[PDB]
PDB file of C-alpha atoms and ligand atoms in Angstrom:
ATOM      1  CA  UNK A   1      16.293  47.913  -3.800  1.00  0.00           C
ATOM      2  CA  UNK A   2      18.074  51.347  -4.611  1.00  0.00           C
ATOM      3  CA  UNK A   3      21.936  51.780  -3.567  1.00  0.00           C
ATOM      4  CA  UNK A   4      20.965  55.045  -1.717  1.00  0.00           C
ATOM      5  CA  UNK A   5      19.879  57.460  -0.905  1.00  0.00           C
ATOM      6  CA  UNK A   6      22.684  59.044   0.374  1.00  0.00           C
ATOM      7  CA  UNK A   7      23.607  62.249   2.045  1.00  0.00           C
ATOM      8  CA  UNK A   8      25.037  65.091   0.127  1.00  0.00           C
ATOM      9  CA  UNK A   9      29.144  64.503   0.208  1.00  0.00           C
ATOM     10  CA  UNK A  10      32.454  65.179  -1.944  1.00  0.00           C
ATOM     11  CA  UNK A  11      33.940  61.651  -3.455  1.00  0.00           C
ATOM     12  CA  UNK A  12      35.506  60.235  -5.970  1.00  0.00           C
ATOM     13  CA  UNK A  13      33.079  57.867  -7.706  1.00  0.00           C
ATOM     14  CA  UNK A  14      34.094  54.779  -9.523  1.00  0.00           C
ATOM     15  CA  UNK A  15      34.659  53.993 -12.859  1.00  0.00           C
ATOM     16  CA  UNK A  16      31.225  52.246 -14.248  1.00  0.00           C
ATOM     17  CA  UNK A  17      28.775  53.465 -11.610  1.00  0.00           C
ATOM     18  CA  UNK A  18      25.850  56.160 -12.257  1.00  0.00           C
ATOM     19  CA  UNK A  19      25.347  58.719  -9.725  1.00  0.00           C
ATOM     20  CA  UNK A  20      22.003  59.518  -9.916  1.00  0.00           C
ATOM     21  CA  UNK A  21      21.151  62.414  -7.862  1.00  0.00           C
ATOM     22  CA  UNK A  22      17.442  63.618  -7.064  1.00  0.00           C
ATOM     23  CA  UNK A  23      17.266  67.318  -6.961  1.00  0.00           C
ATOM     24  CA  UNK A  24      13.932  68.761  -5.452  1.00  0.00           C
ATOM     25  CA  UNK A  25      15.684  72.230  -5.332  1.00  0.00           C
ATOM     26  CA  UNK A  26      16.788  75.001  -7.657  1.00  0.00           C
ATOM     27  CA  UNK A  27      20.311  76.073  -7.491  1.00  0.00           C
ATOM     28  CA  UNK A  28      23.879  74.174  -8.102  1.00  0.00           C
ATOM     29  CA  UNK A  29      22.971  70.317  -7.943  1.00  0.00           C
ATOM     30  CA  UNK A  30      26.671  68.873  -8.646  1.00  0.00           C
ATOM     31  CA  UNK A  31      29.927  70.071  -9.327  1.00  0.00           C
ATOM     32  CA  UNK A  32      33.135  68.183 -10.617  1.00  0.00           C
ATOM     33  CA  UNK A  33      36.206  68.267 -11.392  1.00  0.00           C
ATOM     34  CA  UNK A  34      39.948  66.518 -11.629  1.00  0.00           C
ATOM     35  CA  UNK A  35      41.617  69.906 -11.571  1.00  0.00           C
ATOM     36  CA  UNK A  36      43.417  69.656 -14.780  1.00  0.00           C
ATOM     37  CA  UNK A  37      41.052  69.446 -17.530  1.00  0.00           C
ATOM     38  CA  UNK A  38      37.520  69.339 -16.188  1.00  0.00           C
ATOM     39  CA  UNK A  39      35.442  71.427 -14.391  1.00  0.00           C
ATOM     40  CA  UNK A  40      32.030  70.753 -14.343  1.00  0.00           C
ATOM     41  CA  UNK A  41      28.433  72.360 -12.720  1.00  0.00           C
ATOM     42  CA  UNK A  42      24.873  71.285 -13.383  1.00  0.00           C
ATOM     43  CA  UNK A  43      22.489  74.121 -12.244  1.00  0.00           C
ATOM     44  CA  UNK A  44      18.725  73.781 -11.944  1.00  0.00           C
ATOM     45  CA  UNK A  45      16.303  75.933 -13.005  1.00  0.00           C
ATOM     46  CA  UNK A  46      12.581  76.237 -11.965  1.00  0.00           C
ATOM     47  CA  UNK A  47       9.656  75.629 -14.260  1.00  0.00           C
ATOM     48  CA  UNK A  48       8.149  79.253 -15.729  1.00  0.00           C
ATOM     49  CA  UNK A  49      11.060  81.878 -14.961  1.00  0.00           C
ATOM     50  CA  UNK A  50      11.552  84.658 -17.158  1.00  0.00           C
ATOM     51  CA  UNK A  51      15.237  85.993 -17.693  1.00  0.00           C
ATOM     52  CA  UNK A  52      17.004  86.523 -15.338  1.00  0.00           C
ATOM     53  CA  UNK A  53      20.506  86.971 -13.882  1.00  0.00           C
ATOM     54  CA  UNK A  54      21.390  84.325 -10.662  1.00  0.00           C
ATOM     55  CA  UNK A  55      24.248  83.785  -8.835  1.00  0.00           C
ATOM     56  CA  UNK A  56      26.078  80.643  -8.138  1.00  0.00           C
ATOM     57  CA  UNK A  57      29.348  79.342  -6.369  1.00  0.00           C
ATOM     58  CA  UNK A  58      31.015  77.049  -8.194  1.00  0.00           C
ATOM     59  CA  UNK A  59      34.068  75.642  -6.309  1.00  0.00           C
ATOM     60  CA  UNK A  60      33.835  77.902  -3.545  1.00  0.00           C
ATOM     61  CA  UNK A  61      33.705  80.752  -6.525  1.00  0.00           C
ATOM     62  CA  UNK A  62      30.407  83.491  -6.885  1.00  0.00           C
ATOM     63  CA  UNK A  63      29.158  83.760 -10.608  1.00  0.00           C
ATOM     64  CA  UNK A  64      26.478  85.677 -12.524  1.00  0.00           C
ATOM     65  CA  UNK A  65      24.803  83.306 -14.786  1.00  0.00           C
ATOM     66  CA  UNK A  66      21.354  84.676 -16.978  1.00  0.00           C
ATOM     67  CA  UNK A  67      18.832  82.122 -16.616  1.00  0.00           C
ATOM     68  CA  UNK A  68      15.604  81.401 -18.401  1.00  0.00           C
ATOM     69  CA  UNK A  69      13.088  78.855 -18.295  1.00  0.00           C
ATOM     70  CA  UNK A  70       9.473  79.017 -20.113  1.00  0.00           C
ATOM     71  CA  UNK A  71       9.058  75.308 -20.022  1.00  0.00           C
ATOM     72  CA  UNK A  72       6.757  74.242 -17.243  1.00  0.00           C
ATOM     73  CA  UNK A  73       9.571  71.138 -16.678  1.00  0.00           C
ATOM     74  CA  UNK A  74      12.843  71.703 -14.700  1.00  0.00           C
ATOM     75  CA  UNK A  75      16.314  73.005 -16.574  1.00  0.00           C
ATOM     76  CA  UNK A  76      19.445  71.918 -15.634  1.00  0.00           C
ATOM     77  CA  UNK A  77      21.999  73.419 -17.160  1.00  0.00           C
ATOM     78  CA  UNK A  78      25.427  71.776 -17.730  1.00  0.00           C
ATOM     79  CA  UNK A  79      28.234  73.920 -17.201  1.00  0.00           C
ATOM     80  CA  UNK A  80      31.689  73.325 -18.096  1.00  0.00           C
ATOM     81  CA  UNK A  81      35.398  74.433 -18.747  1.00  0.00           C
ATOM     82  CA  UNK A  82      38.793  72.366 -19.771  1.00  0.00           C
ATOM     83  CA  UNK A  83      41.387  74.791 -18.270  1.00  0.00           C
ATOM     84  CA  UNK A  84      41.225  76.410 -14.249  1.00  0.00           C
ATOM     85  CA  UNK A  85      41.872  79.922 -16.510  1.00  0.00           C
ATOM     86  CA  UNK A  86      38.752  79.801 -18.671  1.00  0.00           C
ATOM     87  CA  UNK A  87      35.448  80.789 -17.719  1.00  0.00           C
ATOM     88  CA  UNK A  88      32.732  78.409 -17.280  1.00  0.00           C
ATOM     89  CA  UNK A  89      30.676  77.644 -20.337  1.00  0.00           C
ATOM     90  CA  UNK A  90      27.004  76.581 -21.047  1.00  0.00           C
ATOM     91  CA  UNK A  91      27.809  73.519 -23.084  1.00  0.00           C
ATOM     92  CA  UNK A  92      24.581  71.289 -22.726  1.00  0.00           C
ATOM     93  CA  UNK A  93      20.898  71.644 -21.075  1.00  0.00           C
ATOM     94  CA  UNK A  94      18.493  68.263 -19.566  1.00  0.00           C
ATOM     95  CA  UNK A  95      14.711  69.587 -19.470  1.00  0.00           C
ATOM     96  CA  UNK A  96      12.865  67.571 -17.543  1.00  0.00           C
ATOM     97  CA  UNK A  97      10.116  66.393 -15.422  1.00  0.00           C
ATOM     98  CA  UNK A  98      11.485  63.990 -13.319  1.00  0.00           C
ATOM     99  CA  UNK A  99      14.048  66.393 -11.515  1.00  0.00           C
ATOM    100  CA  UNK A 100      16.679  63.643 -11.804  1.00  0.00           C
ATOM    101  CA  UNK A 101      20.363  64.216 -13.167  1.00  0.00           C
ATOM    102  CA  UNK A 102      23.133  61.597 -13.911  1.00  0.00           C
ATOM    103  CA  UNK A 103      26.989  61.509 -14.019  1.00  0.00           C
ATOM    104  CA  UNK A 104      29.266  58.587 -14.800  1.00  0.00           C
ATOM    105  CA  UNK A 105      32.643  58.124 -15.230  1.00  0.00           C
ATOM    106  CA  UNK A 106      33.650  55.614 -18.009  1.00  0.00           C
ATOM    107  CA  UNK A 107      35.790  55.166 -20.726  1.00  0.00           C
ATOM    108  CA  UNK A 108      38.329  57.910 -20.873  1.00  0.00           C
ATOM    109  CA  UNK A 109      35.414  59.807 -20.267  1.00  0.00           C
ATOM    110  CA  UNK A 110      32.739  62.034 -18.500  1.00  0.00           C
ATOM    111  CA  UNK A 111      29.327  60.958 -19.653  1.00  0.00           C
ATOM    112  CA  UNK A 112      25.852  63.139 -18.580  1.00  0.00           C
ATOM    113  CA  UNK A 113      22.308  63.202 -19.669  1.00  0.00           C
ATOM    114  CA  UNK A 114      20.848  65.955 -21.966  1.00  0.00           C
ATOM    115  CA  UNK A 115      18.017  66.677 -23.841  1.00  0.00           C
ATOM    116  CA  UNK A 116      14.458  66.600 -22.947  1.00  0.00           C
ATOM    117  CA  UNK A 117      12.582  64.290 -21.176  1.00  0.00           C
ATOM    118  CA  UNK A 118      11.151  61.821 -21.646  1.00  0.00           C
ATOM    119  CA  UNK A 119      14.076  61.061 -24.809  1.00  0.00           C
ATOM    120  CA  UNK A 120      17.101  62.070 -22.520  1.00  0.00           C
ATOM    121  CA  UNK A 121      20.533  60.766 -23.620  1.00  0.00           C
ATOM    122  CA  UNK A 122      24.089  60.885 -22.838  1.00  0.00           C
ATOM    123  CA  UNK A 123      27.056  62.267 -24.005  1.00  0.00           C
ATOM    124  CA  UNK A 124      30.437  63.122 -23.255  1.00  0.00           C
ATOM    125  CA  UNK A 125      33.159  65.286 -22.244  1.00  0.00           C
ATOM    126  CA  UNK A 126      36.691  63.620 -22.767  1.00  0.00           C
ATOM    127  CA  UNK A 127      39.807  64.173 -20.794  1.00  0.00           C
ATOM    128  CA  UNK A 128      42.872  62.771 -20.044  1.00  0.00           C
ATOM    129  CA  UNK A 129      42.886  62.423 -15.945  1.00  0.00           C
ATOM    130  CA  UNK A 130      39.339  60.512 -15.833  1.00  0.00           C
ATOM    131  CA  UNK A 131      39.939  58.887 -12.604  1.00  0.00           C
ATOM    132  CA  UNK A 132      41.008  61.607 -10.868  1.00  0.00           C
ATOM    133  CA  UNK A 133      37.719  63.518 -11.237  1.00  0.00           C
ATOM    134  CA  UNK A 134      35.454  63.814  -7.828  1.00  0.00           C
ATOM    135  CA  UNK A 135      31.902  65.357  -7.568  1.00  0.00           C
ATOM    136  CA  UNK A 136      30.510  67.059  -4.582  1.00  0.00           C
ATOM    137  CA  UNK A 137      26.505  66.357  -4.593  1.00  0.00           C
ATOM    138  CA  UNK A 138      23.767  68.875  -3.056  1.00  0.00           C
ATOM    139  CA  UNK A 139      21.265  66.539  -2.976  1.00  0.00           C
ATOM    140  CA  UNK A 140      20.930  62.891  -2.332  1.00  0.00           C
ATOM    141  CA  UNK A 141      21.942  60.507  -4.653  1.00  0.00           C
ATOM    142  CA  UNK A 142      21.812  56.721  -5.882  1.00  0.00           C
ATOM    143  CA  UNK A 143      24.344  54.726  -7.620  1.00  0.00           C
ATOM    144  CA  UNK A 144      23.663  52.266 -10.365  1.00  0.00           C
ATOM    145  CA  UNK A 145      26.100  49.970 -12.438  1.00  0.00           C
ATOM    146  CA  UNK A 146      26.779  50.985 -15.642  1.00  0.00           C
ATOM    147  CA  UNK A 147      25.786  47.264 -16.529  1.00  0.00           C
ATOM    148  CA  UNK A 148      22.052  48.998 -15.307  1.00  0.00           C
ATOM    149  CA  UNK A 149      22.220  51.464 -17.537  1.00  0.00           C
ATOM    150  CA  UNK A 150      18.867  51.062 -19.453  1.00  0.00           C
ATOM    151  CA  UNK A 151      17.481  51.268 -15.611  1.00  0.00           C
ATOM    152  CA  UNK A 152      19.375  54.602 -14.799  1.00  0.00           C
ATOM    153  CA  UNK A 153      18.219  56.138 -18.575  1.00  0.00           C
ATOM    154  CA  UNK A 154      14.461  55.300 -17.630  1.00  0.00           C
ATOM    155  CA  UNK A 155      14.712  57.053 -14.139  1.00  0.00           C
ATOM    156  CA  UNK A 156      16.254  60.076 -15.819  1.00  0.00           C
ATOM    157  CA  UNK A 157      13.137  60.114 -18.373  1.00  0.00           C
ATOM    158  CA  UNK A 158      10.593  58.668 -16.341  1.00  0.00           C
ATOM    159  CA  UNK A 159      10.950  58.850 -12.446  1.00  0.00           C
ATOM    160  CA  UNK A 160      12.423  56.602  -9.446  1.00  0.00           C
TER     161      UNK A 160
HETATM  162  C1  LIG B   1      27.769  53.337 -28.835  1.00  0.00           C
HETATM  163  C2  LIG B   1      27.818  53.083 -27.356  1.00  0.00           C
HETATM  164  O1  LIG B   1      27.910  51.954 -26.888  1.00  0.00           O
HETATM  165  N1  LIG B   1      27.752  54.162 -26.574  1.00  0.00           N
HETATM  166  C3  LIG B   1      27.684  54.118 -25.131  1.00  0.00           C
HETATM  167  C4  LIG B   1      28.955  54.722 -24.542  1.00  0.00           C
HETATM  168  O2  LIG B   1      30.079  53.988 -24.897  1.00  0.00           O
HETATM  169  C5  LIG B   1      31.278  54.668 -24.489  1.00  0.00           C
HETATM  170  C6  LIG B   1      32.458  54.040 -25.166  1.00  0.00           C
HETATM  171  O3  LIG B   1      32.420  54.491 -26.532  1.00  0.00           O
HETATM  172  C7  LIG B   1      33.385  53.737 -27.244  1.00  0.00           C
HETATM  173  O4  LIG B   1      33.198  53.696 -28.622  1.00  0.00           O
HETATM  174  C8  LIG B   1      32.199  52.704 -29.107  1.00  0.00           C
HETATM  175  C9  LIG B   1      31.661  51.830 -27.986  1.00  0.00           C
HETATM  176  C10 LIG B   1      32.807  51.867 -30.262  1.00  0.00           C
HETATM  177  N2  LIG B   1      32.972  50.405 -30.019  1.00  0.00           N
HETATM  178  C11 LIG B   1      34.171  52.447 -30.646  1.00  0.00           C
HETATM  179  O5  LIG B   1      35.179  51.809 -30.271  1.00  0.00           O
HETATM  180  O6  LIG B   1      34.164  53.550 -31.228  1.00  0.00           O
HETATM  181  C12 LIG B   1      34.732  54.340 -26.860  1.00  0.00           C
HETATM  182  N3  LIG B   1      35.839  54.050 -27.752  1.00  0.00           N
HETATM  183  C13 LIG B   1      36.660  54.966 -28.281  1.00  0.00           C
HETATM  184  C14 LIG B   1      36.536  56.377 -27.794  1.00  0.00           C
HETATM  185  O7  LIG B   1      37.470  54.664 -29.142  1.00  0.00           O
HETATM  186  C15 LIG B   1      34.949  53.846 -25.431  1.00  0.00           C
HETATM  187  O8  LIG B   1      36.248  54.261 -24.984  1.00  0.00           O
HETATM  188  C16 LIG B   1      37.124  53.208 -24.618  1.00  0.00           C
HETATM  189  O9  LIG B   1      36.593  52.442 -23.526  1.00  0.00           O
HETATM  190  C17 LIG B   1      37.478  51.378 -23.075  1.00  0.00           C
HETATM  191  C18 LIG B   1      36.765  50.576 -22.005  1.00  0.00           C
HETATM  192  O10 LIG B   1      35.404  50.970 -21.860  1.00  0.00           O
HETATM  193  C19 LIG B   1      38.788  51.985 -22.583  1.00  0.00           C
HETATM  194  O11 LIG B   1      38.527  52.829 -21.469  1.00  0.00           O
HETATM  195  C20 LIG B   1      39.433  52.786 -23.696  1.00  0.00           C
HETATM  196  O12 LIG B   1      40.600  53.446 -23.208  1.00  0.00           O
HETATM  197  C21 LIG B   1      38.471  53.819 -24.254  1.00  0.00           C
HETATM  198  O13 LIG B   1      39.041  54.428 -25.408  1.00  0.00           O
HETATM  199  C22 LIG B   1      33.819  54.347 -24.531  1.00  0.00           C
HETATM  200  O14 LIG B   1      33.967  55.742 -24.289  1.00  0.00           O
HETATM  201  O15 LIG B   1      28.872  54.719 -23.131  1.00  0.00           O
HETATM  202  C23 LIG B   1      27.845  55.617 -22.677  1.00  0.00           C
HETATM  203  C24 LIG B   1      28.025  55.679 -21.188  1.00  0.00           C
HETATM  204  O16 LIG B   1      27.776  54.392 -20.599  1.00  0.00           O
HETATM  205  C25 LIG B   1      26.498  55.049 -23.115  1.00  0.00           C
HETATM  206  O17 LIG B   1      25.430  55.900 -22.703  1.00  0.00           O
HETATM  207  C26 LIG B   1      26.485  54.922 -24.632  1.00  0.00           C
HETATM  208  O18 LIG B   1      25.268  54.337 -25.082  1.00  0.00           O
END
């Protein structure tokens, strides 16, 4: 009894829910952002690719990003800058099997998944316009209470 799936869309999702999206695909799989001091991307990665350079759009925006994966799991890669100046950032990485990736707003902050499955845990970026931050998805999604947590965690590392 899943809240979803649901359609690719731009929102702004609530404080305390997990949006869970389930990416099949390589290629941008969410992108974020309050306009003042967060921009976020989470790019996938096929299992087995050697370097490479890819492009992207990232707000309506083309970039060149080198790429690697030797893993035979999936790599997102967790993009990120604080200013609209800046250029984007690798800041974290999620390597996993399950193809699932997580965002939540809570708590003054913006919480993901990283690491490798099946051990995946969150962390944060902070900023101070939380609320204001909306997501376009590229693939469907879920949502799950933050009170589910433990539930959203085991997806991420084990599978819907
Ligand atoms: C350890 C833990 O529970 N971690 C959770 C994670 O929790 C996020 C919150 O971390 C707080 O600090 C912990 C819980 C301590 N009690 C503490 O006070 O240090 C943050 N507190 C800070 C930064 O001082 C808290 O932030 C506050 O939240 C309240 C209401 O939630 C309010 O918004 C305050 O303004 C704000 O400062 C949280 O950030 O949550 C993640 C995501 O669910 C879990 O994965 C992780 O296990």
């Amino acid at each position: 009894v899943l809240d979803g799936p649901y359609q690719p869309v731009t929102f702004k999702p609530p404080n305390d829910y997990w949006i869970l999206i389930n990416s099949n695909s390589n290629g941008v799989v969410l992108e974020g952002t309050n306009n003042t001091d967060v921009w976020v991307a989470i790019i996938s990665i096929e299992p087995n690719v050697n370097s490479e350079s890819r492009q992207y759009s990232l707000f309506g925006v083309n970039k060149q990003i080198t790429v690697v994966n030797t893993s035979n799991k999936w790599k997102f890669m967790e993009m990120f800058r604080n200013n609209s100046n800046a250029e984007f950032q690798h800041k974290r990485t999620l390597t996993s099997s399950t193809k699932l990736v997580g965002i939540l707003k809570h708590g003054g902050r913006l919480w993901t998944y990283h690491g490798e499955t099946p051990n995946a845990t969150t962390d944060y970026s902070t900023t101070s316009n939380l609320n204001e931050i909306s997501v376009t998805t590229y693939a469907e999604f879920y949502i799950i209470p933050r009170s589910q947590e433990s539930k959203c965690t085991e997806y991420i590392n084990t599978g819907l």
